[PDB]
Amino acid sequence: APTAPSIDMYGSNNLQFSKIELAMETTSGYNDMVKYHELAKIKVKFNQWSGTSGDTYNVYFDGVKVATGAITGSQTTASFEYGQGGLYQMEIEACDATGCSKSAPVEITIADTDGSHLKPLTMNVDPNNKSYNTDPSIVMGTYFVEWGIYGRDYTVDNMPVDNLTHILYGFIPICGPNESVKSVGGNSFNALQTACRGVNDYEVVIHDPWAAYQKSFPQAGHEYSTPIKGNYAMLMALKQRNPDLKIIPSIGGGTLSDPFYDFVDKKNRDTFVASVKKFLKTWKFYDGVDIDWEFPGGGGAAADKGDPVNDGPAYIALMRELRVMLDELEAETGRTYELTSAIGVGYDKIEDVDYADAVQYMDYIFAMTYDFYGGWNNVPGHQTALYCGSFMRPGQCDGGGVDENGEPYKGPAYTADNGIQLLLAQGVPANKLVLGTAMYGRGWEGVTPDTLTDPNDPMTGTATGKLKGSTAQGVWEDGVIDYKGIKSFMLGANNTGINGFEYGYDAQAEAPWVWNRSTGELITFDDHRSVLAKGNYAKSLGLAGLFSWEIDADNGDILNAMHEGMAGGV
Ligand SMILES: COc1ccc2c(c[n+](C)c3c4cc5c(cc4ccc23)OCO5)c1OC
Numbered sequence: 312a313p314t315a316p317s318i319d320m321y322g323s324n325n326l327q328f329s330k331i332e333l334a335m336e337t338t339s340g341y342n343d344m345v346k347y348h349e350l351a352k353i354k355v356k357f358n359q360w361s362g363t364s365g366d367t368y369n370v371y372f373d374g375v376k377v378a379t380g381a382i383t384g385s386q387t388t389a390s391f392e393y394g395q396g397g398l399y400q401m402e403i404e405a406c407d408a409t410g411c412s413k414s415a416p417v418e419i420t421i422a423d424t425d426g427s428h429l430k431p432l433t434m435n436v437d438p439n440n441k442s443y444n445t446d447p448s449i450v451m452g453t454y455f456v457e458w459g460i461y462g463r464d465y466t467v468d469n470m471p472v473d474n475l476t477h478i479l480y481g482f483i484p485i486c487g488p489n490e491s492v493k494s495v496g497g498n499s500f501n502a503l504q505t506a507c508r509g510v511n512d513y514e515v516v517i518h519d520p521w522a523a524y525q526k527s528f529p530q531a532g533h534e535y536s537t538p539i540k541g542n543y544a545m546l547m548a549l550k551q552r553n554p555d556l557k558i559i560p561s562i563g564g565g566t567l568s569d570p571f572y573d574f575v576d577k578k579n580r581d582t583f584v585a586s587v588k589k590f591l592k593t594w595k596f597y598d599g600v601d602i603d604w605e606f607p608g609g610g611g612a613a614a615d616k617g618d619p620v621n622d623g624p625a626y627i628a629l630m631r632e633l634r635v636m637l638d639e640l641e642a643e644t645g646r647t648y649e650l651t652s653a654i655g656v657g658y659d660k661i662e663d664v665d666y667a668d669a670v671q672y673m674d675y676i677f678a679m680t681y682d683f684y685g686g687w688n689n690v691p692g693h694q695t696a697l698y699c700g701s702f703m704r705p706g707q708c709d710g711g712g713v714d715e716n717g718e719p720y721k722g723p724a725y726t727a728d729n730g731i732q733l734l735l736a737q738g739v740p741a742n743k744l745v746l747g748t749a750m751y752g753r754g755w756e757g758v759t760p761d762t763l764t765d766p767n768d769p770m771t772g773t774a775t776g777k778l779k780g781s782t783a784q785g786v787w788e789d790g791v792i793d794y795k796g797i798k799s800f801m802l803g804a805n806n807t808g809i810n811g812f813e814y815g816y817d818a819q820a821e822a823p824w825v826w827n828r829s830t831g832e833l834i835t836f837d838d839h840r841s842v843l844a845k846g847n848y849a850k851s852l853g854l855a856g857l858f859s860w861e862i863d864a865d866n867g868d869i870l871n872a873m874h875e876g877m878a879g880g881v
């Protein structure tokens with residue numbers, strides 16, 4: 312016979328509670344901003360404004376008692392803990408010696424990072440992406456980048472997820488030496504320094520917490536009280552839509568690889584492996600780990616780093632130790648966790664690692680079969696070709712010849728097939744190898760007719776510098792252009808060339824280009840024809856599948872060709 316409680320929804324954080332506590336209104340150290348609790352802290356205010364309040368309250372979720380306490384006046388705060396994420400029908404009852412009176416039920420939310428409190432995500436995918444019936448055993452991967460939500464305006468709901476088996480989320484940095492990040496200019500180093508305040512060196516952190524979990528996305532129904540927002544809440548709602556889709560954080564990349572060179576000290580691996588375990592127990596929508604160390608032995612962004620004697624053994628030991636750790640997680644959760652890595656495939660990268668040994672611990676190797684040539688110098692070539700191009704010299708394909716100095720080639724040329732053949736020869740199984748497709752071009756200025764040695768092949772010319780362009784044409788940095796920008800502004804609808812560009816295809820390499828004879832602008836990229844050739848190649852050798860870099864740069868054509876290529880090769 313007390314008065315039945317009324318729940319104070321606004322005084323109770325809108326009944327939005329969470330196993331994870333995330334700073335929403337600051338940018339600080341990662342340990343300061345993110346705290347994951349095994350039990351969510353629940354605090355519910357209720358009122359009994361008239362009649363008697365009684366002496367004790369009970370709280371029910373879906374009819375089960377989860378808390379009790381004292382009522383002492385006309386307003387009570389019920390504080391307790393609860394361990395399971397989800398949406399529940401909550402009732403609060405007030406009691407005295409004569410009996411009990413229950414509130415009407417109200418939905419309470421307990422967020423967890425597997426997205427168990429969320430509806431399936433609503434998609435907004437460009438309809439140029441077609442539907443396919445591709446064998447689900449074939450890998451079809453892509454990278455989604457954390458910063459694609461800014462100028463590129465490409466959000467998680469834009470991904471053609473029914474055409475994907477694996478989303479690699481780029482990139483998770485590691486605290487410690489990161490001079491290469493500084494060299495990129497902008498805010499990227501400063502953001503990292505902030506995220507690492509109060510964090511041990513060699514531990515992982517989130518680079519941009521605004522993009523990852525603070526930014527409110529209207530399309531995902533985020534409201535002020537939503538306890539998890541950003542890309543990560545959207546990936547959580549994506550897992551409810553597509554439970555078999557693997558979503559994997561990619562650690563490192565070209566500019567964030569500096570700390571890996573200290574992994575020759577096992578204490579630094581232990582610190583890192585432990586922080587990755589904690590990271591996956593914190594963000595449960597993730598299904599494994601991808602290690603993008605560019606590169607064991609060196610030759611990447613860090614000019615003064617690289618140890619060709621010890622980096623390969625360190626990489627293999629790292630893979631062994633991550634697999635141990637992931638097996639602990641599989642035991643704790645009942646889930647499968649995957650271990651993968653994206654790797655350089657020039658012969659001088661491959662020779663520094665015994666991949667046949669490393670790969671026994673791994674599910675997949677994503678072969679970076681792109682960036683073979685690029686704006687960093689003035690030598691044109693196909694950046695993502697399957698085979699050796701018409702432009703190459705005698706003995707250059709297999710490395711048995713001499714260059715224009717008369718200098719012996721130090722190894723076989725940079726092509727996808729040479730890279731893949733070198734891995735198979737070390738004894739990596741074909742069915743663990745994933746072949747990469749570029750969703751972007753690299754290019755140059757100043758490759759005019761007078762520089763060519765063969766007048767029908769601009770890959771025989773010489774450049775004056777990197778391609779220049781605006782973000783409106785998909786050029787986010789010098790010498791790189793989105794495939795969707797190439798299609799809009801250089802190929803046009805009929806794929807024959809606009810705005811002074813012509814299209815060419817090197818049938819021996821399996822590689823397209825567009826060339827503007829007057830500016831000497833030349834761009835090397837993947838198109839519908841080269842991507843069908845890559846799918847036939849992957850089929851012929853019994854590779855795991857295909858992957859691409861990066862998804863925001865496609866308009867549908869590249870991913871469609873990946874699926875069409877894997878249906879039809881032979
Ligand atoms: C011939 O010696 C050199 C000298 C400098 C570099 C290099 C290789 N890479 C990948 C980079 C590099 C790679 C980057 C970058 C910046 C970079 C800046 C310099 C080099 O930002 C993203 O990726 C190299 O190859 C062994």
Ligand SMILES: COc1ccc2c(c[n+](C)c3c4cc5c(cc4ccc23)OCO5)c1OC
Nearest residue numbers: 565610611612681682683684685686687688
């Ligand atoms: C010593 O001369 C240099 C100077 C700069 C570079 C370089 C070689 N590579 C491969 C790169 C490079 C490679 C990249 C990249 C960015 C890059 C940026 C600079 C260089 O993005 C991913 O691939 C080099 O050796 C030819």
